[model samples]
Target: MLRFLNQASQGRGAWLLMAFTALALELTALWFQHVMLLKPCVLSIYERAALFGVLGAALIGAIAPKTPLRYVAMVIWLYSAFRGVQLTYEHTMLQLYPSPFATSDFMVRFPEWLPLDKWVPQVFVASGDCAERQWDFLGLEMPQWLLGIFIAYLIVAVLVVISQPFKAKKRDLFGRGHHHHHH
Candidate 1:
């Protein structure tokens, strides 16, 4: 899998995969909210925002492969992953020790500035409290899953960036080693 990812990163495949993965995650969230009737919380909205950022970056990276945009995308992915870890930690603590202040109240104002929720309330807005756990897989909650995905993305991004120069060197070596012909 790592080998495949490395090869994919050398081309447009990695970026496209990242874009598709983010899109799938966003769609799954929508499914949970609309189809399953699981109300989205503030954390959910925040997660959506992070996913949206990843999607945007991935799309750009795909369109322009030989640019610094991939690095930019990696940075965004790292930020979102760190945020996910923080949110998950806070949620876990809240679950243990009940807090009067809700995560929703804290996050609600933040999203208002971005206003994805305001622009598309049905898709982006939070309708429930963040503390509510609607679903879990293998004992890990939604936030954990998101964190895992972000971590994976970060690793892939780093590998791709590191390998990029090598690919260029290989091309230069095979094609032409700075040989110029004057007529």
Candidate 2:
């Protein structure tokens, strides 16, 4: 079992690591939301889009062969990385200014008739319903930490893409014919 896990990781283990990291971060966010430090605002919802993308990539990488799937995983990493950058910027702005805007509150202020207005719903995915959540951390908000981790994951994803074989090659492990003649 241990050997199998080790071998599997070489091909798709990186994606598993990425998924684990995401799960841990999301759990931490839920904890903070429970404490009332940060609210899950509209911007927070957009940030989650990246998470979903990465999660999907990781899942696909685990099952798919080590060739074509690598390209798909790379795309996932790129999209998630872009989203991470955006979220990090917003997180930094909030830390510097400490505004009630919460990266998502501005959307609510917009006229309800706008199509984008419905993008973020009131109900939270993991926790209880809260309109505007606070950033629950010692100083840096969830988005900042999430952004950093996502970048790291992106790096791993790129490495995985590069490390895969140039082309798929499968060989039979067992000997096909007896080579021995009469001794």
Candidate 3:
């Protein structure tokens, strides 16, 4: 299975599929915030940022999956994938245990250098409380659903990274054999 992914991971379509799904997640989140009027909280924006990290990585990977750039892409993917799991799990706890006494400051923080809070106030500005659970999906709260996605990203990204040395050394994207080892 992992070897199959090793071959597939070298293709543009494969990486684009990952990118597309990640995009859909953001659009859906946007809809939830705008269409449904459920304001996003601190962790919500953070998870959204985390997804953007994976999205950017997948896009970069799609553009040059056969090149060593894939390694860089995978590294970023690993960072945000790991981050996604942590953020989602933390969000899960907040939803699971709400506390009026415990609440984040109204405005979320962004990278000071980037200052998305000041620039992209439309999405980055979150007025909602992090400790509240707004929506439930399939009898599970939405954060749990995101937790599942983050876990998938975590597991699949790790598999692709580890499988590289074993499966992708000799047989890369297509038929010919470069056999170029990264060592």
- The number of the candidate with the highest lDDT is 3
TM-score, cand. 1: 0.70
> Would you list the clashing residue pairs of candidate 3?
none
lDDT of each: 0.67, 0.61, 0.71
Instruction: Show pairs that collide, candidate 2.
Output: 38-133, 38-134, 38-135, 39-132, 39-133, 39-134, 40-133
Which structure among the candidates has the greatest TM-score? 3
TM-score of 3: 0.78
Clashing residue pairs, backbone N/CA/C < 3 A, model 1? none
What is the RMSD, in Å, between candidate 3 and the native fold over all Cα?
Answer: 7.2
Ranking by TM-score: 3, 1, 2
TM-score of each: 0.70, 0.59, 0.78
CA lDDT for candidate 2: 0.61
Task: Tell me the tens digit of each residue's lDDT in model 2 across 22-80.
Answer: 78777766686678665456556656767766777778767774557667666767766
For candidate 1, write residues 61-118 as lDDT tens digits: 6765567666665676567656755666776677657766643264354355666557
